[PDB]
């Protein structure tokens, strides 16, 4: 359990707790991560992981690196969590042809601190057998009464014009 | 060619299955070489009077089984004696037509009487019936003296019984309990006695003479008379007849197996149930169809003939040539078969030679019946694509009264001893009513038939009153069959009312009579004599003027349901209750719409369906003549309301339900400036439809208009759904259709690489079954259901029954409809569907035995005698046989649901998960199993919607904010919708977009399943629901080092990976964190 903390291909475990639940009985959320090997070139200092946590965007992603600055006493930024199709909406681009699942890649703004939170990562990846008690929660999102018929509701017709417009123009 | 030589095939290896062996027939005729030595040792003693016979067996064992009336010592003037008789052979073992059956048969030994011991005057006043009962309990008395001193008697029993069920020939019965053993053939001797071959004059036994003198014609009386004589002579006509044809036992072989499917048999139909006319008659008939058969004598069955012309001449004769009240069929033993065109009321086979009605035994309400299945097998004779040996004989049809009929109703019969009958029934019951149907049982039979007739009437098939409890057997040392049973001296418990109902006139509010006049006319008198302060002068519509009732119309009941409750308690009895708590309880489970007449609408009642395709007609009416810069062509909705699909119907203002707005797909005109792209594609036909909303916004102030995007298209996030709803109330989802949608489908399949292929052509089937099949499919769904308007009332039932039990978050409605639509196209071996009674029954036992895997599903489109051919159905064949290479076990291909205009088999059928599948066949076969074991009842008739969600790792209990039952239109309410149109989709289903999200990302390692409609599906609030979901088999075991493992997995070493289900429950936990009320974890 706890004696894992490096995989075999490499992957640094990112082992969380999970929030406490009304309808639940200290339960984790495990993630995996690694330094993406790629010559593009906005995917420079970026990270791919495995396994994100539930309702994870690019708040989750400034977050748990805030958390990360103030324990190691390092200082960094994140700049875009890259394809995070939760859903997969965009798992598949029906436009080009007529014409790495439940994954995602947490880009940062530079090589100074992206290799400065992969070195916290690892420096974290230990609290699951010498501190398990400081292993930092998932404060995942909760969707309420109201967002829940967001998806049900009208769309603003100010933005579907304009646009339907530009997309004949 | 091959419709006889396959259906050789089919009858040869069938008679082989029931093939009797003769090690059987062996052991049994060495006990009758036992029987006829012990009766040839039976002596004769004296001739005594009446008054004699009862002192010599009252301190005996043996009882006279003396039949109403029994005799008295005032009107006794003769005597009676016993004799050494002449027995024989008589039936289907006197003319080799026995088989293996496992419920037995009995062997018709016939003793005949003899000749000297009758009078001439024997005839008349029940004499020779007297010497039969005498004798009877007479050979009884001194075979037991014979069978006791052979010692055989430890495994051999006597009792009393009657021959054909009919109680006016006394008889014993001889059997093996469990060298002359036939205990291990299970074949019982029937010791008949009948009397000797026109001992009587044959001429004074006719049907229309009398021989209760004290005359009416005494048709049924004269029938026991007559018949006790042709024993001998019809026999022999049967036994050179089956010299002639080489085929005359064999396809009376499957007479017998088709005529025993229906409950057709040589029991008596007279007595209060479905017979009069089976094996004996059948074959009786099979002699006068080889001996001619035309209205002049003309040839209809061939002597040279097989089993395959034989068998299908015969029952087409007796559907086609009428012999209850338009003809009547003539027959010669002593000469040719020449129908005669006059009827008599009634089954009447005329015997010309021996002068008795060989079609007596059957009513008039079990003459009918058989007939209808008659032009029904005779019809699966005539199909040239399918197979219909098994669904003649081989499929049981005589297994449930919910099954074969409408409905039955349980009216118990209190009537109590026969003398009280002056105030139990209405009726006068004397002698002279008791002359010809002298039996008890038989009187009350016809007589509930018939007041059931004017009741009834057009709006049923038949009549079938049944006597339930009604046995045939009595002890030899007691006198008949006497029970204390229901609270009656009657020979039945009670008595139950059953009746095959034809949809169009079933529920018909206006009693219709015969026309008015200045004095009452002799028709006009019956029918206001049967209603009374009912029947009242009502107008037509066309200015015409009759006798009329009208009647009370319930969402739970039809109205013949008061009828058979009102014409019961004038004329049958006074203290009977008739019933129907089984079709009461099932009509519940259906929503509730909130109209006006809700509760006062039956059933048949679709007019609140059809008023919202009037709205939406107006609603198009604005669309069409509308001039843009692309005309329209095509202006149709493929939406659940116009098809009668929906769960809910359509009520206005009713934004809480799932089917609220009715898909709109439209065509505008043939264009090549369409962009060939995707998401340019519906970005161009969406601005069409914003000047169409232009024109429905500048001067059409009284439909609504807003914008929405339809995610049920994987892939494509560019459509824009068209959202008008009407002043009155009633919404309509608009998208618009070109060339262009297949035309970008089937690009993106093909120029794909072999990856990523099958989700853009699932995702084209969503294109499809939406835009390119949904009208096709759309034109049929509103067109026959015009021949079974009780499709309408099931299939939107099934449904409902389908989401209580968590079934409806996989399966599309079209293919749930077409599942339920199975049992009116194709309803064989049953009749017609026509109630939601009827409607589920026949869907709850035909999704029980529906094996995925051997046979797939092909239903014809067709209305009532379009469908596809013989090599157009084999084709459909094809498309079975070469899935199941890789999908043989239902896998990854289980529901192939195919029909003439998608004969793939897997239109709205595709991309759903097996094991749901084996759930939804495991719910049918459960739900049928306990209707026949328990019995049908309204604990076990509501349980069919009462899920127990077991086998669950997760079964997650919530409850939304706003209960919206009454806002779906379900009346346990819609009115009026907000100044913004937004706020309408506060009050909807909130589990629906929140289980959306939880197959959509948690696909790989659960699986979930919810319910759409939460409104009906939610008990009180109409907002509970429940939602079970299942691990994959895949991820149950360790899974290795990947990265497109594609689950929510934890670390269990440094080598594997394992899904915690402690995330897994969060995770679905935190996103229903306002809806988080309870989840079960295992």
Same mark, same amino acid.
């Given at each position: ?50 396994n994100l946590p539930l309702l994870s965007n690019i708040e989750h992603m400034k977050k748990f690196v805030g958390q990360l600055c103030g324990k190691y006493d390092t200082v960094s930024h994140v700049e875009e ?89 | ?137 007479? +050979?009884?008395?001194? !075979? =037991? ?10 495994? @051999?029993?006597?009792?009393? &019984? *009657? ?121 009786? +008939?099979?002699?006068? !169809? =080889? ?10 069955? @061939?002597?040279?003939?097989? &089993? *395959?012309?034989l068998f299908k001449g015969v029952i087409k004769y007796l559907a086609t040539m009428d012999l209850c009240h338009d003809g009547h069929l003539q027959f010669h033993s002593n000469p040719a078969s020449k129908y ?113 007739? *004017? ?628």
């Amino acid at each position: 359990i706890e004696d894992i903390s490096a995989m075999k291909n490499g992957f640094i475990v990112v082992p969380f707790k999970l929030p406490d639940h009304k309808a639940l009985p200290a339960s984790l959320h495990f993630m995996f991560a690694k330094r993406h090997q790629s010559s593009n070139s906005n995917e420079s200092d970026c990270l791919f992981l495995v396994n994100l946590p539930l309702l994870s965007n690019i708040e989750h992603m400034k977050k748990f690196v805030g958390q990360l600055c103030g324990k190691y006493d390092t200082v960094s930024h994140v700049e875009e969590l890259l394809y995070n199709d939760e859903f997969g909406l965009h798992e598949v681009d029906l436009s080009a042809l007529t014409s790495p699942r439940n994954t995602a890649l947490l880009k940062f703004v530079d090589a100074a601190s992206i290799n400065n939170c992969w070195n916290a990562l690892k420096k974290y990846s230990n609290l699951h057998a010498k501190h398990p008690n400081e292993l930092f929660e998932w404060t995942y999102t909760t969707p309420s009464f109201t967002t829940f018929v967001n998806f049900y509701k009208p769309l603003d017709i100010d933005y579907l014009k304009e646009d339907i417009h530009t997309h004949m123009a | 060619l091959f419709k006889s030589n396959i259906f050789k095939l089919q009858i040869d290896e069938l008679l082989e299955q029931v093939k009797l062996k003769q090690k059987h027939v062996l052991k049994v005729e060495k006990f009758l070489h036992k029987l006829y030595d012990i009766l040839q040792e039976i002596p004769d003693w004296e001739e005594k009077s009446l008054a004699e016979v009862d002192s010599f067996f009252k301190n005996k064992i043996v009882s006279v089984p003396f039949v109403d009336p029994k005799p008295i010592p005032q009107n006794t003037n003769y005597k009676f004696n016993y004799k050494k008789p002449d027995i024989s052979l008589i039936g289907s073992f006197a003319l080799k037509a026995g088989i293996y059956q496992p419920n037995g048969s009995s062997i018709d030994t016939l003793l005949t009487m003899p000749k000297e011991l009758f009078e001439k005057k024997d005839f008349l006043n029940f004499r020779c019936l007297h010497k039969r009962s005498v004798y009877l309990a007479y +050979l009884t008395h001194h !075979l =037991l003296i014979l069978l006791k001193k052979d010692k055989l008697d430890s495994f @051999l029993q006597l009792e009393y &019984s *009657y021959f054909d069920n009919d109680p006016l020939l006394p008889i014993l019965r001889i059997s093996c309990s469990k060298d002359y053993n036939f205990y291990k053939t299970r074949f019982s001797i029937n010791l008949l006695i009948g009397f000797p071959y026109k001992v009587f004059e044959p001429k004074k036994l006719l049907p229309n003479r009398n021989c209760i003198r004290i005359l009416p014609a005494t048709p049924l009386y004269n029938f026991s008379v007559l018949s006790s004589s042709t024993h001998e002579n019809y026999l022999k006509y049967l036994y050179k007849t089956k010299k002639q044809t080489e085929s005359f036992v064999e396809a009376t072989v499957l007479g017998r197996l088709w005529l025993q499917q229906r409950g057709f048999s040589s029991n008596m139909s007279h007595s209060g149930s479905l017979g009069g006319f089976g094996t004996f008659e059948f074959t009786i +008939l099979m002699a006068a !169809l =080889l001996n001619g058969g035309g209205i002049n004598s003309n040839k209809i069955l @061939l002597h040279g003939f097989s &089993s *395959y012309q034989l068998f299908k001449g015969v029952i087409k004769y007796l559907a086609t040539m009428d012999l209850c009240h338009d003809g009547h069929l003539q027959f010669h033993s002593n000469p040719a078969s020449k129908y005669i065109d006059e009827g008599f009321q009634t089954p009447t086979l005329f015997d010309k030679s021996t002068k008795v009605n060989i079609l007596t035994k059957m009513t008039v309400s079990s003459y009918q019946i058989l007939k209808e299945y008659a032009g029904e097998t005779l019809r699966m004779l005539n199909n040239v694509v399918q197979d219909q040996f098994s669904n003649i004989f081989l499929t049981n049809i005589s297994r449930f009264d919910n099954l074969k009929y409408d409905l039955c109703y349980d009216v118990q019969l209190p009537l109590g001893k026969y003398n009280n009958l002056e105030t139990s029934l209405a009726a006068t019951f004397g002698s002279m009513e008791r002359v010809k149907f002298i039996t008890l049982e038989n009187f009350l039979a016809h007589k509930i038939t018939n007041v059931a007739r *004017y009741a009834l009437g057009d709006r049923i098939k038949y009549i079938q009153i049944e006597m339930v409890g009604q046995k045939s057997d009595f002890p030899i040392t007691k006198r008949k069959v006497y029970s204390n049973t229901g609270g009656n001296h009657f020979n039945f418990d009670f008595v139950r009312v059953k009746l095959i109902v034809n949809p169009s006139e079933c529920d018909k509010l206006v009693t219709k009579g015969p026309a008015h006049s200045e004095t009452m006319s002799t028709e006009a008198a019956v029918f206001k004599n049967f209603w009374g302060i009912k029947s009242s002068l009502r107008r037509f519509k066309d200015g015409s003027i009759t006798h009329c009732c009208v009647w009370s119309t319930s969402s739970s009941e039809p109205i013949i349901s008061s009828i058979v409750n009102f014409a019961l308690q004038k004329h049958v009895s006074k203290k009977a209750q008739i019933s129907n708590e089984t079709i009461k309880k099932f009509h519940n489970f259906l929503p509730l719409p909130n109209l006006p007449s809700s509760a006062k609408t039956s059933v048949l009642n679709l007019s609140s369906f059809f008023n919202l395709k009037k709205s939406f007609d107006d609603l198009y009416k604005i669309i069409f003549q509308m001039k843009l810069p692309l005309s329209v062509k095509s202006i149709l909705p493929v939406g659940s309301a116009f098809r009668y699909t929906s769960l809910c119907q359509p009520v206005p203002f009713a934004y809480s339900d799932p089917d609220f707005f009715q898909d709109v797909i439209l065509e505008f005109e043939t264009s090549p400036k369409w962009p060939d792209e995707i998401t340019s594609l519906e970005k161009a036909k969406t601005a069409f439809l914003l000047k169409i909303q232009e024109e429905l916004s500048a001067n059409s102030s009284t439909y609504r208009s807003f914008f929405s995007r339809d995610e049920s298209i994987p892939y494509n996030l560019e459509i824009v759904t068209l959202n008008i709803l009407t002043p009155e109330g009633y919404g309509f989802k608009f998208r618009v259709l070109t060339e262009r949608d297949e035309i970008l489908y089937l690009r993106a399949i093909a120029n794909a690489r072999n990856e990523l292929k099958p989700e853009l052509e699932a995702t084209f089937l969503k294109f499809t079954a939406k835009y390119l099949a949904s009208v096709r499919h759309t034109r049929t769904l509103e067109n026959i259901s015009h021949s079974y308007q009780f499709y309408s009332p099931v299939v939107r039932l099934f449904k409902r029954w389908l989401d209580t039990h968590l079934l409806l978050g996989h399966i599309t409605d079209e293919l749930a409809e077409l599942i339920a639509i199975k049992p009116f196209v194709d309803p064989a071996p049953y009749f017609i569907p026509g109630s939601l009674e009827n409607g589920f029954l026949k869907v709850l036992k035909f999704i029980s035995q529906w094996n995925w895997k051997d046979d797939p599903l092909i239903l014809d489109l067709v209305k009532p005698e379009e469908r596809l051919t013989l090599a157009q159905y084999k084709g459909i064949q094809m498309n079975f046989t070469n899935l199941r290479n890789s999908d043989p076990n239902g896998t990854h291909l289980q529901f192939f649901v195919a029909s003439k205009n998608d004969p793939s088999g897997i239109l709205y059928s595709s991309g759903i998960p097996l094991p749901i599948a084996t759930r939804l066949t495991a719910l049918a076969k459960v739900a049928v199993n306990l209707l026949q074991t328990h019995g049908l009842n309204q604990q076990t008739i509501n349980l069919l919607f009462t899920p127990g969600l077991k086998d669950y790792d997760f079964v997650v209990d919530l409850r939304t904010p706003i209960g919206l039952k009454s806002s779906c239109g379900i009346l346990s309410a819609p009115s009026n919708f907000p100044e913004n149109l937004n706020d309408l989709s506060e009050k909807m289903d909130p589990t629906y977009q929140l289980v959306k999200y939880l197959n959509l990302k948690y696909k790989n390692s659960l699986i979930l399943s919810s319910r759409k409609y939460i409104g009906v599906n939610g008990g009180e609030k109409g907002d509970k629901n429940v939602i079970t979901g299942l691990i994959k088999p895949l991820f149950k075991g360790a899974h290795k080092f990947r990265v497109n493992l594609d689950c929510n997995v934890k670390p269990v070493d440094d080598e594997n990976v394992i899904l915690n289900k402690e995330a897994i429950f969060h995770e679905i936990a935190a996103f229903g964190n306002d809806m988080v009320i309870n989840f079960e974890t295992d």
